[PDB]
Amino acid sequence: DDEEETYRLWKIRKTIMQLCHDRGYLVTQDELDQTLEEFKAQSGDKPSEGRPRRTDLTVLVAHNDDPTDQMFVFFPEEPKVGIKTIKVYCQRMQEENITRALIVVQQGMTPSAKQSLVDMAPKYILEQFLQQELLINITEHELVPEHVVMTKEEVTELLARYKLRENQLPRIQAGDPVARYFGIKRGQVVKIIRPSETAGRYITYRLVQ
Template sequence: MVTSDEETTRLYRIQRTIMQMLNDRAYIVSDYELNMTKHQFMEKYGDYLKRDALSIQKTRRNDSSDQIYVFFPEEPKVGVKTIKNYTNIMKNENVTRAILVVQTNLTPFAKTCISEISSKFHVEVFQEAELLVNIKEHVLVPEHQLLTDEEKKTLLQRYTVKETQLPRIQMNDPIARYYGLKRGQVVKIIRPSETAGRYVTYRYVV
């Protein structure tokens, strides 16, 4: 079946957001992948675009052992069988992180399955509708930078505070989900300021 133009445009926009997201999370993404036009996207994936053709694996810039998969399941409502297929792929490749881009949602059993494997596999679920526009490009969203463990330690020493005394950001906050933040991490937020040029705050992920 030939993919409709509307569907192609939708998948093109979703894939573009995913590439920007991976780049912002410090995974290796080429300029070509970041700047791909819709025409190039169609040339690459063709008229008979199957969602799973968009699935990719990426490596972190400064740590080749840290890899992530992005899966685009074909079925509208993802079940346990699909989750198990993906975790088998991850196990074979020794990859513990994945992003699942689902059309609508997961079955209740699939949700349970993801929470049961969460000690071994970190699987994030995004609905396609959430990725049509990159939340980071919204005018009200300031720049976020994840601190390394070393930077976090320095920050806490400099201000003589415990991490739990910092202002908080919820793990399910849309921007925290975009960056794939985990509980216990600290993120630096940089806002433009008319007086100081920029205004920096820190948030502890809970």
């Protein structure tokens, strides 16, 4: 140990910050290009590094939309996040007035805790991510095409040009890894740029439902 754990932590942090960058939140270029040596300078050993409190991120505010809107990232120490830690994070976000949170589980989560996270509060939106999936970026994969979230007016002009409805567009599950990666709400349509065999690109659209 003390060598693979810190590397996993650095790579998960890089993947999470790239995810936040893809969603359009405030991230600096220094955090974008962060080598393993920078994380070692931050913490070079496993006991020196704190998963529950040192790895937390709170500077995530929408540079495009609003500095008031804020996202938080949690890294629970225990492998199976209990409902106690969930309630602690909930009251912390209530005190800090943060309605968007992400959690990085280590090995799993209790079913009661899963149900609670599902229906803890309609105003507080919390996402779950396994640390195993976060070891690699889904967007950087060559098989996965480029996905861009569309706005309301873009979907409107699309349906006007194609003379369609929302329910007639192709569907995509909300539990899709890409859907959780982008945090897409139900009812939105995303454009997908498939790389063709030639120089051209195929443009398609999928409704998150």
